Amino acid sequence: CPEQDKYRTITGMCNNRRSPTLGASNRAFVRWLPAEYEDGFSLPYGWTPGVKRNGFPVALARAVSNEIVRFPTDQLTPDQERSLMFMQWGQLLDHDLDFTPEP
Amino acid sequence: NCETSCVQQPPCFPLKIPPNDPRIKNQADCIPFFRSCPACPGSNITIRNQINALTSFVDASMVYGSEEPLARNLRNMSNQLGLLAVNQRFQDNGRALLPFDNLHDDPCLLTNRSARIPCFLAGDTRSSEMPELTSMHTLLLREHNRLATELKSLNPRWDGERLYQEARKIVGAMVQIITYRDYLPLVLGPTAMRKYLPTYRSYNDSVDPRIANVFTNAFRYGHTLIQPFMFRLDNRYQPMEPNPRVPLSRVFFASWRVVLEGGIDPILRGLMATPAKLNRQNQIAVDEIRERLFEQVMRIGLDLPALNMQRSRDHGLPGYNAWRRFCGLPQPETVGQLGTVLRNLKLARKLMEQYGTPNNIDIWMGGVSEPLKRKGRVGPLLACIIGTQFRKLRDGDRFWWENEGVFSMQQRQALAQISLPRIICDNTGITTVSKNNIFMSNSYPRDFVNCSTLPALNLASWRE
Numbered sequence A: 001c002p003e004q005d006k007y008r009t010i011t012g013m014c015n016n017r018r019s020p021t022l023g024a025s026n027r028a029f030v031r032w033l034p035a036e037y038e039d040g041f042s043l044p045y046g047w048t049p050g051v052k053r054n055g056f057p058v059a060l061a062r063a064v065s066n067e068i069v070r071f072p073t074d075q076l077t078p079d080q081e082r083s084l085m086f087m088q089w090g091q092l093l094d095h096d097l098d099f100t101p102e103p
Numbered sequence B: 001n002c003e004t005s006c007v008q009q010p011p012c013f014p015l016k017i018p019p020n021d022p023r024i025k026n027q028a029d030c031i032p033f034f035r036s037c038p039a040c041p042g043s044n045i046t047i048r049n050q051i052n053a054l055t056s057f058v059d060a061s062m063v064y065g066s067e068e069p070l071a072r073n074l075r076n077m078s079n080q081l082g083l084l085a086v087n088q089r090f091q092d093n094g095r096a097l098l099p100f101d102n103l104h105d106d107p108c109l110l111t112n113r114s115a116r117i118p119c120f121l122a123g124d125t126r127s128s129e130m131p132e133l134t135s136m137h138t139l140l141l142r143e144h145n146r147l148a149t150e151l152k153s154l155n156p157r158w159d160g161e162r163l164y165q166e167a168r169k170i171v172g173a174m175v176q177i178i179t180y181r182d183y184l185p186l187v188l189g190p191t192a193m194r195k196y197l198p199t200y201r202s203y204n205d206s207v208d209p210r211i212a213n214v215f216t217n218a219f220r221y222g223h224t225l226i227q228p229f230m231f232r233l234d235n236r237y238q239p240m241e242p243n244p245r246v247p248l249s250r251v252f253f254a255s256w257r258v259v260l261e262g263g264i265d266p267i268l269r270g271l272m273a274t275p276a277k278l279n280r281q282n283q284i285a286v287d288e289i290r291e292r293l294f295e296q297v298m299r300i301g302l303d304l305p306a307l308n309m310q311r312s313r314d315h316g317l318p319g320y321n322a323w324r325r326f327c328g329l330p331q332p333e334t335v336g337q338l339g340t341v342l343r344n345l346k347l348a349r350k351l352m353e354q355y356g357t358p359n360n361i362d363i364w365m366g367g368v369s370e371p372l373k374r375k376g377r378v379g380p381l382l383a384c385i386i387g388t389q390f391r392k393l394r395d396g397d398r399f400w401w402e403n404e405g406v407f408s409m410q411q412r413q414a415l416a417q418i419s420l421p422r423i424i425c426d427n428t429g430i431t432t433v434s435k436n437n438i439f440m441s442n443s444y445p446r447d448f449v450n451c452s453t454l455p456a457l458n459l460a461s462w463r464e
Ligand SMILES: *[C@@H]1O[C@H](CO[C@@H]2O[C@@H](C)[C@@H](O)[C@@H](O)[C@@H]2O)[C@@H](O[C@@H]2O[C@H](CO)[C@@H](O[C@@H]3O[C@H](CO[C@H]4O[C@H](CO)[C@@H](O)[C@H](O)[C@@H]4O)[C@@H](O)[C@H](O[C@H]4O[C@H](CO)[C@@H](O)[C@H](O)[C@@H]4O)[C@@H]3O)[C@H](O)[C@H]2NC(C)=O)[C@H](O)[C@H]1NC(C)=O
Pocket: B204, B205, B206, B207, B391, B392, B395
C-alpha cells in the first residue's frame, strides 16, 4: 500500500489505506442486515418444500410475477418527465458498481 | 447443467412453475437459475455471502475493467498515445466501435445466425446484453481516446501511461458528475436527495465504500423503467425505417444490430427522444423482460422480476419489514397497514395473498410496489437503500473528483462544465441533443438543442 499515489489502481485496492480491500474487486459484499436462510446459514427460503418462512408458506417467484407484475403491454404509461436515457444510465452505472458472479 | 436441468441440486435453484401459468403449461419445466458464487465455498461455519467482481467506486470500471489482465488487454499497446483498443474489422461512419471479445461460447452469434457478429469487449462483461448498453460503452470508449488525443497535443512530453491515466481520471470524474448532479436527484427526488446526499465536505476514511448485498437487488428498481422496444431514429429524429421499434426479446445480445443496422447514433437518438416507461402500481414491468428475457439465446424465455425475487432469496436477504425498520420507516403488519403504506389497498391485498405477511415480501417486490416520492422514481424504502449506498461511494472514495488533491481548483471548475449531451456531441455524428437535464428531456424538438450552444470541456488547466 503506497504512501503517496496520483491514480486509482484498477482493482480498487488501496483506495482505503486502513482496510485496503474496501471497495476493491472480487470481495464479499458488505451486509447491512444479518442474512436469512432456511437453515440459518446457507439454504435459501423456498429450497425445501413445506418449510415456512416466519409462519407463512414461501410464494413461488414466478407466481408473484404472474399475480403482481404482469400487465397488458398496450396499457403502458410513458413517463412525461423521464427519457429512456434515464433507464440506460441506470444500467450503465449499475455495471460500474456490482457484478455478482455465478458458477 | 442449471441451463437444462430442473433438479434442485447445488448450485441450481430453479424457479418452479405455478398451476395456470400464462406461458409455461408444462409444470415439470422450470425457469433456470444458478445460485450466486459463495464467498466461502462449502462452509458450515460462515453465514453464506456473495461476491462483488467489480470495484464499488464510481470509477468507470465498466470502461477500464476491475482486473489488471483485462485492463491491460483493453488498452492500445501498439503505441504511446494512451488509448483504449478499438474494433479493427468495423467502424461506425469512420468512428470507433468496441473491440470484439474472443469468446468460445458467444451468445451474440445466436441472435443472427448469418450476420456472424460476436460480443463486444468492454470493462464490464455484460456490455452486449442490450445494444443501448453497448452504445453507452462505445460512447465512453470514444471519450477516453478523444481526451487522450487532446492531452497529447497539450503535453507532447507525456508518455502512454500518463496519457491513459489522466484520461481515465477525467472519464471517472465525468461518470461521478453525471451520476450525482443529474441522475440521482431524479431517482431520489429532492427531499431524499437532501436527506441521504447532503453537500459534500471531504473524504472520510472511516466510511465503508463497499456495495451492500441488498443494493444489488434494490438497484434493480430500473427494471420498472424498461420499454418493450428499442427505438431507433434518423438524423431528423424520425422513426428509422425499417424496424424503428424492435421488441426487446429481439435485441438481447444483438451486437450485429450495432455493426450492420446503423451504428450507435440511431440508438442514442432513440434513448434521448423516447420517454422511459413509468412505474405504476398496476404496471410494474413489461412482458418483454417478464416473459421473453433472452428467449432467442436460451431454451426458454426468462422472467426478470421473478429472477430478482429468487436472487434475493439466494442472497438470504431479509424481507420488506426488516428493511423498512433498517431505514427507520414504519413496518406494516397486515393488509390494512400495508394498504396505508402503499396508499393502495388493491396492491396490498395482492401482496398479502402471495406472502401472508409484509415480513416476507421480497425486497425488490416491496420496494417497487411503494408510491413514488415527489419528483423521484422510487418510494421511501428504495430511496433510503439507494441514497445510503451512494453517500458511502462518495464519502468513502479517496479519489472522489471534489476531494482535495485529486484535481486542482481550476481542473474542478473546468470539470463542472461537462454533461452527457456534450459527450454525445464530441463522439458521434449527432448535432441536435437533449437540453440539460438529459434524464428529464424526452420530446423532440421541444427538449432539444444544438451542440454549438453546449460548452466543451476546457483542458487548458491540464497543461504541464
Ligand atoms: C466519518 O464517517 C464515519 C461514518 O459515518 C457514517 O457514515 C456516513 C456516510 C454518514 O451516513 C454518517 O451519518 C454515518 O454515521 C463517522 O463515524 C460515525 O460517527 C457516529 C456518530 O459519532 C457513530 O455513531 C455512534 O455509534 C456508537 C456506537 O454504536 C454504534 O454501532 C453499534 C454496532 O453497529 C450499533 O448497535 C449502534 O446503534 C451504533 O450505530 C453509539 O454509542 C453512539 O450513540 C450514542 O451517543 C450519541 C451521542 O454521542 C447519542 O446521541 C446516542 O443516543 C447514543 O447514546 C453513536 O450512534 C458511528 O459509530 C461512527 N461510525 C464509524 C464507522 O466510526 C465519522 O464521525 C465521520 N467523520 C467526520 C469528520 O465526518
